[model samples]
Target: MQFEERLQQLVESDWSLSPNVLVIVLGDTARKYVELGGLKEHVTTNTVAGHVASRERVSVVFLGRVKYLYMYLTRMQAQANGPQYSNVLVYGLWDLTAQDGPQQLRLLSLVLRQCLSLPSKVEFYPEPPSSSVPARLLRFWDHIIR
Candidate 1:
């Protein structure tokens, strides 16, 4: 089946992502992507904001307090280099205690794996929490199947 059909299925049945939810997902995805060696270089806070902003289809919105930022992938290129459907990536961050970091990352991974129908090669990074950290990072890499 085509990518759009697959995305629609996921959005309708699983993700059901709202604009607010999407931003968090995109941030997480970008973070994790860096950890997994998918990104060419380290991603700083500024780089993250710039990348999302440069893409016409992507939008970032602030919500709740100033600290909360949301990203949404609204459109895809008509003749994208790879997939037939436009893909949406969302990223998020929450100010939970250190104890909550691992669980949050795992949950985010599960959601992305299911909603995106991710391939086996799209790996999760940082080795699943061997130690405690105040915050967690995440990213997702989609294989550009030609």
Candidate 2:
């Protein structure tokens, strides 16, 4: 599928994100953002519920370098299920090209930042790419989001 290919390209390319990179969604408007983006199918009710349950933070983690994208809502202290057991949910940048990826993420960052009390919101990991293109795009989107 092109979706999967796009994801693979992300991971292999400079856009690959580090583990535990956080994206704090402002609850009230976040749901609307999700719905409008046609990402409702990828929604994670359990993840949001866990956020309420633990009062913890949600972060995106990559797997397989990576083929999978998971959101983990976790707290520092141990819980009844043990310290290791925490909330896990699926997430993605499905249907986005490399150029489009930063734009979407920038919009998300804007939404979260506008609400305040929150968060690359993309920083390149595993070595930076040799171009100002992503940088310029990010700054452009940053203004748009603002």
Candidate 3:
């Protein structure tokens, strides 16, 4: 399916809410949250889900295996008078680096430039040699949008 279509499915299928809440929440799409602990463990699965979500909810996940980045955008339901949504989430993970990590850092920089659509540039720290380079490399390519 197309990216936007997949995203619509995710939002329609995955985004939901319960009616047993004590307080009335207008935008409570999914009250019974499933805690997918340890962000690393959810990288692949979440990325696929998030990619679909991005087209519908304005979200994105950038990664390099050991590290994963998440970005989302949402607008307040009440205050959403305009054509666009104001809510946005942009965050990621980065393992520390050692000497001669500039090459990796540079590559990450390029990926950030290409992946993000923010007004300002995105930056990241390098990983030390002691860190898992293989994992980092795996995440780096995995998150790149084709």
Query: What number of backbone clashes does candidate 1 have, counting pairs of residues 3 or more apart or in separate chains?
Result: 16
What TM-score goes with each of the models? Answer: 0.23, 0.22, 0.24
lDDT of each: 0.32, 0.32, 0.33
Q: What would the TM-score be for candidate 1 when compared with the true structure?
A: 0.23
lDDT of 2: 0.32
Worst 10 residues of 2 by lDDT: 65-74
Q: Which regions of candidate 3 are displaced past 4 Å?
A: 1-34, 37-88, 96-99, 118-146
Residue pairs in candidate 2 whose N, alpha carbon or C atoms collide under 3 angstroms: none
Rank the candidate models, highest TM-score first: 3, 1, 2
1-146 in candidate 2: lDDT tens per residue? 32223223222332111222233222333335544664334333343333343233334333321112212222222234533312222233222223466674564344223322112223222112335453444445547655
Q: For model 1, how does the per-residue alpha-carbon lDDT over 1-115 read when each residue is reduced to its tens digit? A: 3322322233333222221112222344445553465533432223433344334322333233212321111122222463332334332233211235477566544443343
